[PDB]
Each structure stands twice: as C-alpha cells, then as structure tokens.
C-alpha cells in the first residue's frame, strides 16, 4: 500500500476528494490521464485574446454552496456573470427581444411555453433526485423519450422546438435519445429549469475572476503538486478485499481505498478484476456523454450590452444554440459565448470549421448588429471527440437505464468509491456536483479508515 487513497482523475471532483482526504490527515495520491489538471474544467490564462479563457465549465450558481466555499477558501475571488439588458430569442428565424427576461404575452406561442415549462417542473417534482428510479411511476417514465413526451404534451411546434433546444444545450443530447425519467430527474436535481435556465441568476450566476480550472490547480498547489501524477492513464483495476491495485500499462500503484472520479462512460474504459456487478456494469456501459461545442467570440467592445442587450440568446433553428456574455471586468476585450449540443452539434460538426464560424458570426450579426461580423478572436472547442471527456457537457441516459441501475451511480464496490459530478445527489452534471460528489466520497473513506 503506497498510499491510503489513490484518486483517479483530476477534475474538481477528484481534487475536492483529494483536499478532503488530505486535510483529514490521510495519505492521498491523484492519478491523471493526460497532461493538464482541470477536468471538463479547462483554463488558459495565456489565452490568445484579452483575458484568461475557459474551454470548459465556468459558471457558478447562486446556490452552488460547496463550490463557492471550496474555491473561496482557496483564495479565488468571484464576479457577477449576468448582464443588463434584454435577452434575445430567435424562434423560427424571427428575432424576439425579451425585456425583464419576459416575452410579449401576446405572442401566440408564449402561453403554452409558460404552461409546458410549469408542466415539466411538476413532472420533475413527481420524481425526486434521491430515488428517481423508485418514484411513483419511474418504470413507465423511463420507457418514454423526452421527445415522445413533448409530442404527447405540446401542440405548438415552436414550443416543442424551444423545448428541444433547451434539452440539447443543457444536456449534450437531443430529446429523441434521452429518457423522459432521466430528464425529469435532471430538472429536479438542479432545482427546476427556471434555475437551470437562468441567465442572470440560477445556475448561471457568477464566475471565478481568474479561470475555473483554478479550483483544481490551487488544490494541487496546496495539497502538494507532486501528489498528482499526470499522464498516468489507469487501464486496469484489481480490486479485492484488502485494497486496490491500479495499472497504467506496466506501471502500477496500490492503496487501501481508491475513488474513481470521472464520468460513467470514461470509467467503462478501465478493466476490472473481478468484474463489476452487472448493476454498475450496465450503468457505466449504457450512460453516454452528450455531444457539444463551446464557441467564443471576442470583440474590442461589448456592443451588445452597450446597445441594450444582455447578450443572452436562445435560438431554435438558425444554429441551435444558447448564448451568454462572458465579459469579466478584468478582461481587456468583450466576449460573447455560445453552446451547441446534441443534434445541433451533429448538424454543425457535419460542416467545415470555417462554415461553422460564419454561421455563428452570422447569427451574432443578425442578433446584435454588424459589429459582430468581424471579431478580434474566435475559438471553438469540440468536446464530443475529446480524448478523455469523450463527450458533451454532461452524461445523459436513454430509456431503460436510470430506472434499473441508477442506484449504481452512487453505491461503492468493495474499496472502490465513486465520485465525479454524476455521483452527487444534487447538481450531478454541474461543477457543484463534482465537488460535493468528491467530498461525499472522501467523508465515506475517512470513516472507513477509523474502522
Ligand atoms: C463546454 C462545457 C461547459 C460547461 N459549463 C459548466 C458551467 O457553466 N457550470 C457548471 O457547473 N458545469 C459546467 N460544465 C460541467 C462541468 O464541467 C462538470 O460537471 C465537471 O467538471 C465534472 O467534473 P468531474 O471531476 O466529475 O469530471 P471531469 O472534469 O470529466 O474529470 C475527470 C478526470 O478524469 C481523468 N480521467 C479519465 N479517464 C481516466 C483514466 N482512465 N485514468 C486516469 N484519469 C482519467 C480526466 O482526464 C479528467 O481530468 C460544463 C461542461 C462542458 C463540457
């Protein structure tokens, strides 16, 4: 036993678990697959534009309690995300301004849009976040797809669409490939879509003035930058009754307990001896990652805020993207950012890189003026082909798995413990989740150490 606990994966989740066990006084060792310490939390302060840049997650939610504390104690300083102005909606190619986040009640689609939204939150509430697979009608629910449900519950094609877009960007998938039960679950465990869809508050409420990968770096620096072995891809795990043996090719390590902090899909790439119980086996073998693009355009001035727009945008057909401002007071030049996922990623990944960029800039132009036509910096980062993330923004599920293996999302197997945002009780999918998941995992192993 080289160390007490070896944490596989250096995401905010693995890092949170590391700092947790370390502060508790246990010997810790974090093993990373590639050469950078963040996870789906990727930062570059050397960033070609005027300010550090995040290629991964970066928004902090107002109820993101654990993340705020962790990073704040680490010395990081937050900053407001939201921007003053009208949010924009492009429904069926038409540009609609929403003052006070509110859309003209007279528009024909708004009413059913407001109703279907509530209807969703209700469904989400009927199945919690604790025992979704056990809720009053899980089985039934995990049989339909968010697609067929929208079909069975919404008349308007636009309401149907802007619902679809929401799913696609919020998850990395399209409603036609996502369990209805799994979505109600997600909406529920992230405190409703109103919270999930906020642009000023809710989940999108603030940033780490400095970059999001910092929580993991600062933890690394504190706990001991040498306790992180980068480029140590784990490919096999002998997990028996006295401890666990990790293998990175011919290389190997051993600890009493290990916490595997990553997405279920990413973990399925690792061989287990003995085999994992069919329950978890199925879960990490049938829980895919979304498909996603993170696009960013940088300009000299925030011509959108300065023209009365928040920079927030929801487009159902031109491109199929959610748009948000990313201009922190510190940055030298303004930055607008969009997210293309699911079937939208699909359609666009089909074109050339430049074809995509213009499609994006064209959208920006028709939404905030001609000043968007010629940006100072433009970058896109495809995540569906990322070596280790292997996917979109979060994990998602097709009909038939959450209801029958969801439990495996959390339960340990011998000395192997599961961390990673997807293991959190709440906010599984967001950073908050990664932190909690990893702290929960640690708390568990710490108690296992005192016998
Ligand atoms: C474009 C994008 C934008 C996002 N925006 C937000 C946002 O605004 N707010 C928010 O809250 N969340 C956001 N997220 C989600 C957030 O990034 C995740 O919830 C969080 O980073 C998950 O953390 P994790 O530590 O569980 O996993 P990861 O960050 O995926 O880290 C797992 C680690 O495991 C390593 N690993 C994988 N396989 C192996 C192996 N075999 N051996 C060793 N190491 C391995 C990986 O290299 C990686 O570093 C976003 C995600 C994306 C993709």
Author numbering: 30 to 480
Please give the exact wording used by the authors of the publication that reports this structure.
Originally described in B. oxydans strain IH-35A, CHAO carries out the initial step in the biodegradation pathway of cyclohexylamine, a high volume chemical used industrially as a corrosion inhibitor and in the rubber and water treatment industries. The CHAO structure can be divided into two domains: a cofactor-binding domain composed of two four-stranded β-sheets (one parallel, one mixed) and seven α-helices, and a substrate-binding domain consisting of a twisted seven-stranded mixed β-sheet and eight α-helices. The active site of CHAO is located in a buried cavity located at the interface of the substrate- and cofactor-binding domains. An examination of the three dimensional atomic structure of CHAO reveals that the overall fold is substantially similar to that of the human MAO B monomer, with a RMSD of 1.1 Å for the coordinates of the α-carbon atoms.
In order to determine the holoenzyme structure of CHAO, we employed molecular replacement using the A chain from human MAO B (30% sequence identity), truncated to remove the C-terminal predicted transmembrane helical segment, as a search model. Four molecules of CHAO were identified per asymmetric unit. Most of the polypeptide chain could be modeled into the electron density maps: residues 30–480 in the case of the holoenzyme and residues 30–478 in the ternary complex. For the apoenzyme structure, 90% of the residues fall into the favored region of a Ramachandran plot and 2.2% are outliers. When superimposed, the structures of CHAO crystallized with and without substrate present are very similar (RMSD 0.26 Å), with no significant differences in the positioning of secondary structural elements and with only minor differences in the conformation of loop regions. One side of this cavity is occupied by the flavin cofactor, held in place by hydrogen bonds and Van der Waals interactions with the protein. The isoalloxazine ring of the FAD cofactor is planar, and a lysine residue that is hydrogen bonded to the N5 atom of FAD in other MAOs (via a water molecule) is positioned to play that role in CHAO.
